[PDB]
Amino acid sequence: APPGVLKIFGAGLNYKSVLATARSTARELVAEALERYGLSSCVDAFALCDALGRWRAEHLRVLGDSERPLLVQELWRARPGWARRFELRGREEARRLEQEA
Amino acid sequence: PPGVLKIFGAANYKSVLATARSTARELVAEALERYGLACVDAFALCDALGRPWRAEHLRVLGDSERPLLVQELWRARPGWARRFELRGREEARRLEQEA
């Protein structure tokens, strides 16, 4: 329910804070994080990622365009002894890293 | 390390063995066979969340996603309950928003 701030970290861009409400889509937060790094066209070229590790990410998931990142942040936790953070990444790079086991 | 996942159909369920390499589409396919179907595209594997039933929030997994990792590397928010559901795509994609 309550609006939250999300720390969106840049990789190949340190984080940008973003106000996200429970009706904020991932694609909307991508656009916002993009201009907050100083960049419409290249929204689809980038991707928001739920990333996990122990800083190097050991696994990640590319969020769907109309997924709601606040709820992803809140309704799921990382398994015990794992770090977790949202990341702004090139789409092809991120979709690739989804396979690196 | 491979694991047995409970794929509920929406009480009762079918157990499938997931390897670290196994994709969501492959597990839809296998769970469909185990459900007795003679089309795989019309269904979706879902990470669903409720409380200790009916599901308050769900996420449709992508075809290429690896359910064993989804289940093991993430937890439900403390207090909530979690399971994999098998649903019709068109209905489950619609069901995501009502939360």
From Swiss-Prot, chain B:
Highly expressed in heart. Detected at lower levels in placenta and pancreas. It is found in: Cytoplasm, Perinuclear region; Golgi apparatus, Golgi stack. Residues 1-91 form the Ras-associating domain. Required for the proper formation of vascular structures that develop via both vasculogenesis and angiogenesis. Acts as a critical and vascular-specific regulator of GTPase signaling, cell architecture, and adhesion, which is essential for endothelial cell morphogenesis and blood vessel tubulogenesis. Regulates the activity of Rho GTPases in part by recruiting ARHGAP29 and suppressing RhoA signaling and dampening ROCK and MYH9 activities in endothelial cells. May act as effector for Golgi-bound HRAS and other Ras-like proteins. May promote HRAS-mediated transformation. Interacts with Ras family members that have been activated by GTP binding. Interacts with HRAS, RAP1A, RAP2, RRAS, RAF1 and RRAS2. Interacts with MYH9 and ARHGAP29. This is Ras-interacting protein 1. It comes from Homo sapiens. The gene is RASIP1.
